């Protein structure tokens, strides 16, 4: 595992040498290939190195980050085009990636938290540094302060577990089952925030709408998963307490998913709409996760991988349109099929994946969470039908409205799509399908 870490560390100096922007991604893509060869993992931890291991769960999430963090560099070519502190920008991602790799590769719960939040600050610099609109302040704080407010109490819950278990290592924790009501709320309300839950999602539409394209990728790509990944490790020893209060979370997320889907239909901003679509699906992920069944756990792991690639993908396309039309509102963006017809194909495939269209990896995960939820209670069929219905209602509205109609009138002349953009879109979607072939690996982490 140290092979990855020391590779990244020695790539830090590449931020300082000039005319090395493009030589960075290749080193970032090549390491993904090298990491892609060392899959021999199992449910239990493997490749121990001083505190760094990796199981099938951590592997897929790590590999997802390397892929996504590599696409960030492709997407944010404008930073290179205007030399807008590109060297500092590169160092932000290389640091950020290292924090993620450690976070998932950490074997002890305290470490996971140590790099859990620490990744936030590199993200926070990203929003303020390279965001256009003035609201990146008022969205910079929300991201920082919702997270800190609920992560600091989690730190107490972590330490209280040493004095009982005597250690942080995940395997040793699973041997215990705790009965204290507050402790349950000090290790899940901290992750329920970052999922996010419907009622505490108020930061998500602000952070995503204002953050740059690259920040949108990682915020939607890996930050929403750290909440999901964290839960998968800490419901193991909260099984008893999970049964007394699960019905509160399931109802909120399920009803939260439906209500947000209606909110999606009344949006008029591409960035906002995609961001609210994240809350909709993340409600199903959390819902199935708390069902605790074998299906709900394997499925939740799957959907987190698939959704991140998609929602990250859809943020590419919004940036492409915004870069030229200059406005992210739906009213400006119309009939793009008649300006950039080649682009509209990628709009569809990424859009179709978001609505659980086949043969994507997204449908495999969504079939499963749906199974666990139904088994949990037949009453869940009511909204789970509504949520899947409306989860396509806004996706069509997102795609159709922005691509189909007659062209805008005031738009000034702008460049057409470039090869970089097409290559970026392929790398987002094409794995999202081929992964179905080897779901063997990225599914059975239990």
């Amino acid at each position: 595992m140290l092979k990855i870490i020391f590779f990244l560390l020695f790539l830090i100096p590449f931020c300082f040498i000039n005319n090395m922007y493009w030589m960075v991604q290749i080193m970032m893509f090549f390491i993904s290939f090298i990491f892609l060869l060392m899959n021999n993992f199992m449910n239990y931890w493997s490749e121990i190195s001083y505190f760094l291991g990796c199981d099938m769960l951590s592997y897929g999430l790590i590999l997802l980050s390397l892929w996504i963090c590599s696409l960030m560099l492709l997407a944010s070519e404008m930073i290179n085009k205007h030399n807008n502190y590109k060297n500092l920008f590169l160092l932000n991602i290389i640091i950020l990636l290292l924090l993620l790799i450690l976070t998932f590769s950490s074997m002890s719960l305290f470490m996971f938290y140590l790099f859990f939040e620490s990744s936030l600050i590199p993200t926070l610099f990203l929003i303020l540094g390279w965001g256009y609109q003035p609201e990146r302040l008022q969205a910079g704080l929300y991201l920082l302060f919702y997270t800190l407010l609920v992560s600091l109490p989690m730190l107490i819950g972590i330490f209280y577990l040493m004095n009982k278990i005597g250690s942080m290592n995940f395997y040793l924790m699973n041997n215990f089952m705790f009965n204290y009501d507050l402790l349950y709320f000090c290790l899940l309300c901290a992750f329920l925030v970052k999922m996010p839950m419907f009622l505490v999602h108020l930061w998500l539409p602000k952070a995503h709408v204002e953050a740059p394209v690259s920040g949108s990728m990682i915020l939607a790509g890996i930050m929403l998963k750290l909440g999901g990944y964290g839960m998968l490790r800490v419901i193991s020893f909260l099984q008893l307490m999970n049964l007394k209060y699960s019905f509160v979370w399931i109802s909120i997320s399920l009803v939260g998913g439906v209500l947000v889907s209606l909110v999606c239909l009344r949006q008029t901003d591409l960035k906002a709409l995609i961001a609210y679509s994240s809350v909709a699906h993340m409600g199903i992920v959390l819902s199935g996760l708390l069902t605790m069944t074998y299906w709900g756990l394997c499925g939740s792991y799957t959907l987190m991988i698939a959704h991140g690639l998609c929602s990250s993908g859809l943020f590419c396309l919004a940036n492409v349109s915004y870069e030229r039309l200059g406005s992210r509102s739906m009213l400006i963006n119309k009939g793009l099929l008649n300006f950039m017809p080649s682009m509209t194909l990628w709009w569809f495939l990424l859009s179709s994946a978001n609505m659980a269209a086949p043969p994507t990896l997204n449908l495999l995960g969504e079939i499963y969470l749906l199974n666990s939820i139904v088994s949990w209670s037949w009453i869940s069929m009511i909204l789970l039908s509504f949520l899947s219905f409306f989860s396509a209602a806004y996706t069509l509205y997102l795609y159709s409205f922005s691509q189909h109609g007659k062209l805008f009138s005031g738009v000034y002349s702008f460049s057409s799509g470039k090869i970089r953009e097409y290559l970026l879109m392929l790398l987002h979607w094409l794995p999202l399908n081929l992964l179905i072939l080897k779901s063997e690996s990225f599914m059975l982490w239990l």
Partner: protein, 54 residues
């Protein structure tokens, strides 16, 4: 900026989400408790347990 807890807004917000959540969260708790009670009591033979594989 133009929001105010004017009662109409409260009445709007009350029925909008809070009761759908509360009523439906109540339904989930009710249905599972009834179903759970049978299992704990030992009513359902393992032959008849639904969703064996879930």
């Amino acid at each position: 900026e133009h929001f105010k807890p004017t009662g109409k807004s409260f009445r709007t917000g009350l029925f909008a989400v809070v009761l759908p959540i509360a009523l439906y969260a109540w339904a989930l708790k009710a249905e599972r408790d009834g179903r759970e009670e049978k299992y704990r009591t030992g009513q359902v033979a393992y032959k008849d347990r639904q969703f064996k594989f879930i």
